[PDB]
Symmetry: C3
Subunit: 376 residues, 3 copies
């Protein structure tokens, strides 16, 4: 059985009968007629609404944490996947793999109507990237978010604030290892690691970048992937954040992201070499410094450079201290936030030092990334 | 009458005839065939294009102010509402309720084809949230925007710059009580009120938050909804803005949002207790300080804290003045913008004081919120 | 031949037979039935998916530079244009006009399946804005981007980083003359010109705005379109940037956008009057200062004002130096970045001077705009 048809040009001056259906052979679609409107009413092909992802609440993430190891996709969520229309009329549980402390997971809605998480960010086990659509993810932290203002524990669990979807997420290209602070912006859960090109900026249980362990040189700014910076200047850490679509925090962002940490308390000892791990000779465990949003080592471990200048100035003469990229005159300090392991009672969510010019490279300054919250 | 149909798998190898219409029984949609392409051309179900909202000009708001109390939705606006395609081929009047000075209104496109405003932000009177779709809103201000640089008047009217829609709006979750400054970013029409949890940050005829009338403690940072901060430090104002998805202005934003105010002039008297209302003993009326964008009390009434540091530093010694959240070293002032009622000829759209550390909490400093402009 | 049909209310209780197709006469669409679900499964009209623009990779631009004067639209790109569905299953060459050094081009997808560029931003030659849909563009630069840190050449060619599309672009309303820096944010290729209202902020071979040649007064802040500012204070440049949906760069942005320039080198001579052109008496050619991203005269030519305050303060005494818009107390310097033609070895991608208050207006300070990267 074939229906009445013709080109779009033939349809343009065609007022059919009421309830007549024809086929536009140029467009390969149906045109409905009403016996009055010339041209009729063409229907949409599926090609145009592929990649459709609709949520009932566009200003909230698509998933809900229901327990330490469990989560659900929300009701009224519709996801086009592999030509199919997969929807969830009620809250539906997400099928989890084995969960391992300090690991990021992707959530997929598959063409068979199921929803599931996986450590693989191309495709979940038993599927391909065609039959399973990556729609979001979360971080499975090594410890809880702070319930009050005394840090958290060492019980691994899903960080509820780390839940992102493809329309509710970090603006940074890579959303992994980040958490949403008070609904306003995202922060890296972990301090920047040396090997941030392969690991991303925010990873559990890696060597922390600082003035004595400089980060890998950005491949977007002359790095080859092996080379590191010679030191931990503000300039270098800032460059690394730009590489990853992030920036260093300002004071408003830092006090927000670090809230929940144990205030006026430092790690103690002689160093904090590693993210999410007790420091060298430390008197407080890493989890003492977990913020309400699951920011790990949020204060009292290492200063983070900040994206703000002020305080003590350098010399009022040109000083070539930018790694060979010009000189500075009356250069103000770049902000340092949080305090370090040796700061005793000066550390906190509002701890700030404005005595270091951006060229300084001590062992006790690293960096934490932040970025804008993106709704699509 | 029933049509030839099968599963998607049966359709995959099926190359029918030209102008053949079949039914995919898995997708419950029509598949047009051309007698050549295997699989055919599946058509889109309506579920995938619910929440459709299309504007002719995506880089501008969907509505136009046509007078003090009237507005239209723009031609070429298509709006899906409860199954129905509602479109406006010409500029169409919005049905208005009684308009009350200093009130925010929501605009709805209803399934009967009408468009109407209402002070209720769930549903207009005579409709529900299902038969009426909130697509935007505006602020009906207590006075005019400034036509030049001498403030405005006291004739209540729609603020054209306060018009927002669901794809042209403040990035902050709550778009109410904000105005678009020079197309670049949004600013709170009103200074922050004490009771901002219930009122939002920007509300007419409320008590202003300052150093001697601290804002309600953010419920995202340890507040219970009843208690206020112990004082009105920069820290607390910045936190309140973060809560609401906003920030304090920088100097570039402040001069823009305040342009149109009466420069080098202050409210006079002894206080400015209330938004959108004359100050206590004021020698200038409140409307003298309305900006071009309809920012009320934009200068010369109360300083706003700013999101920028510099100027005079605190001691080059660790100072525990952050409300118990660490110490600061060589802490630069946080900018103050605009001047207060007591600032005589120092006030204006570029008035700035950089002698106040963030720990200061005076009766003459409050806050005004800003946030990014969001196009979707 | 007419099909069974009725209103939407009649369709509500109607459960048809499997594979039945009726016509909703209110919606003028087809409803597929399955013999169980009441209401059936309505199909979408084409009206709801007009403006459809879909890319395989939504986190990258839709085009690829394939040579100095050639480019292609990417595989998997689907564009609605004038009723048609135009798709490119493989990388498809863009038809180019004559390309002229220092010119912006728009890319159009047309309703005959062709893709083409044109210097005209309303429609390409041989088409209208109805039969040709503007979906992006690029800058054809007067010389290459920097391959390393010695600037670029003077071979006119497409700047790969200046490629934008309608869903991958500067947040600023006008995306022309900008380039994407490290995937993170957009920068003006050229320093701000005097005639920025008609030219945009970023244009080749125009007079550069600075303290001795003030920019046109913004028409959003009291300008008539002919008058220039009384001087080139920070305030005026910041206002111009706000007008165009941009801002001055912070330190993190400046070091990123200028990377690739010839470091510790200045233009020399007595002046740099013009964008993309050798300075007056210059000892280094303009292209020596082209950055990796194709930012022209990125360092060593004129200082840019920055959107950050610190360093040397003005008097701790109210000073009326804001052009009649209030007074400032302890005003910190506004950052200057890059060095100017007379800065010898002090110039570079991290050159900074914090000794000029915002009220200063010398011949060697101009401005460069930046804005956020927008993905839709
Ligand atoms: Mg270390
Ligand atoms: Mg700043
Ligand atoms: Mg008060
Ligand atoms: Mg000049
Ligand atoms: Mg500063």
């Amino acid at each position: 059985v074939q229906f009445r048809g013709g080109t779009t040009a033939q349809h343009a001056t065609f007022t059919g009968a009421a309830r007549e259906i024809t086929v536009d052979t140029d467009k390969n679609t149906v045109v409905v007629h009403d016996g009055a409107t010339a041209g009729g009413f063409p229907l949409a092909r599926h090609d145009l609404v592929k990649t459709a992802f609709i949520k009932a609440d566009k200003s909230a993430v698509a998933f809900t944490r229901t327990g330490n190891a469990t989560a659900s996709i929300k009701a009224g969520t519709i996801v086009e996947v592999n030509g199919k229309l997969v929807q969830f009329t009620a809250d539906t549980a997400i099928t989890m793999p084995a969960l391992t402390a300090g690991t990021d997971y992707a959530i997929y809605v598959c063409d068979d109507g199921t929803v599931r998480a996986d450590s693989n960010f191309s495709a979940p086990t038993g599927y391909t990237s065609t039959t399973a659509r990556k729609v979001g993810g979360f971080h499975y932290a090594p410890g809880s978010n702070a319930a009050a203002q005394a840090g958290g524990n060492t019980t691994a669990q899903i960080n509820e604030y780390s839940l992102w979807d493809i329309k509710f997420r970090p603006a940074a290209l890579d959303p992994r290892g980040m958490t949403l602070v008070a609904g306003a912006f995202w922060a890296d859960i972990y301090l920047l690691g040396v090997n941030h090109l392969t690991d991303g900026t925010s990873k559990y249980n890696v060597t922390i970048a600082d003035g004595s362990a400089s980060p890998k040189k950005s491949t977007k700014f002359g790095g080859d992937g092996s080379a590191a910076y010679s030191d931990g200047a503000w300039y270098n850490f800032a460059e690394v954040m730009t590489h990853h679509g992030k920036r260093l925090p300002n004071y408003n962002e830092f006090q927000a992201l670090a809230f929940g940490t144990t205030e006026a308390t430092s790690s103690g000892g002689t160093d904090v070499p590693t993210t999410g791990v007790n420091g060298t000779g430390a008197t407080s465990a890493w989890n003492i410094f977990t913020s309400k949003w699951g920011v790990v080592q949020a204060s009292g471990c290492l200063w983070t450079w900040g994206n703000e200048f002020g305080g003590v100035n350098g010399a009022s003469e040109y000083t070539a201290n930018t790694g060979g990229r010009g000189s500075v005159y009356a250069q103000p300090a770049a902000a340092l936030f949080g305090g370090n392991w040796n700061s005793t009672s000066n550390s906190g969510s509002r701890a700030a030092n404005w005595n270091s010019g951006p060229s300084n490279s001590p062992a006790n300054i690293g960096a934490r990334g932040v970025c804008d919250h993106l709704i699509l």
